[PDB]
Amino acid sequence: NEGDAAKGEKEFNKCKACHMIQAPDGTDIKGGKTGPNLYGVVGRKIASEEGFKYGEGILEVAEKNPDLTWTEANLIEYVTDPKPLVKKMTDDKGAKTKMTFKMGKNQADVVAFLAQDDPDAXXXXXXXXXXXXX
Numbered sequence: 758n759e760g761d762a763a764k765g766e767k768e769f770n771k772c773k774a775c776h777m778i779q780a781p782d783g784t785d786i787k788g789g790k791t792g793p794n795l796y797g798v799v800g801r802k803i804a805s806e807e808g809f810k811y812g813e814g815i816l817e818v819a820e821k822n823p824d825l826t827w828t829e830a831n832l833i834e835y836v837t838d839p840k841p842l843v844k845k846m847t848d849d850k851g852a853k854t855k856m857t858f859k860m861g862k863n864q865a866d867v868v869a870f871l872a873q874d875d876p877d878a879x880x881x882x883x884x885x886x887x888x889x890x891x
């Protein structure tokens with residue numbers, strides 16, 4: 758749980774194919790365009806990132822919770838098995854997701870790494886209400 762990242766990035770080898778890292782400019786890692794830029798996230802806002810085809814669910818939830826800025830404790834949950842977070846949260850059963858990867862062995866190890874890439878947590882903040890605070 759010692760959330761590495763060394764191990765965390767190694768594994769990213771398991772998101773890379775759906776997912777890009779890139780920055781407002783160049784690309785750390787290199788990954789399929791299926792899924793969004795995974796860079797930033799941590800600090801972000803569920804589904805913000807523009808010009809992608811977000812699954813309708815994350816979309817409505819981002820909505821019910823104009824709040825949610827992907828901590829990385831959310832990252833841990835989500836990726837673990839995302840429907841059960843997405844869903845649960847809208848309460849609307851029949852999540853859907855566009856993400857089907859289920860990752861159940863090394864969670865924090867990863868959020869760790871992705872916490873890092875999105876360097877802004879700003880030392881601290883911008884809000885609070887649990888789950889959010891970004």
Ligand code: HEM
Pocket residue numbers: 769771772773774775776791792793798802803804805806810811812813814815816827832835836854855856857858860867
């Ligand atoms: C553990 C490796 C990966 C992690 C850590 C991960 C993380 C995430 C996160 C945090 C989101 C929500 C972002 C937002 O709110 O915008 C997301 C959305 C998504 N992911 Fe992944 N992901 C992983 C692997 C993959 C893979 C392998 C695929 C393709 C096979 C994929 C497809 C998607 C899609 C389509 C969405 C959009 C969901 C929607 O709009 O409703 N992901 N992912």
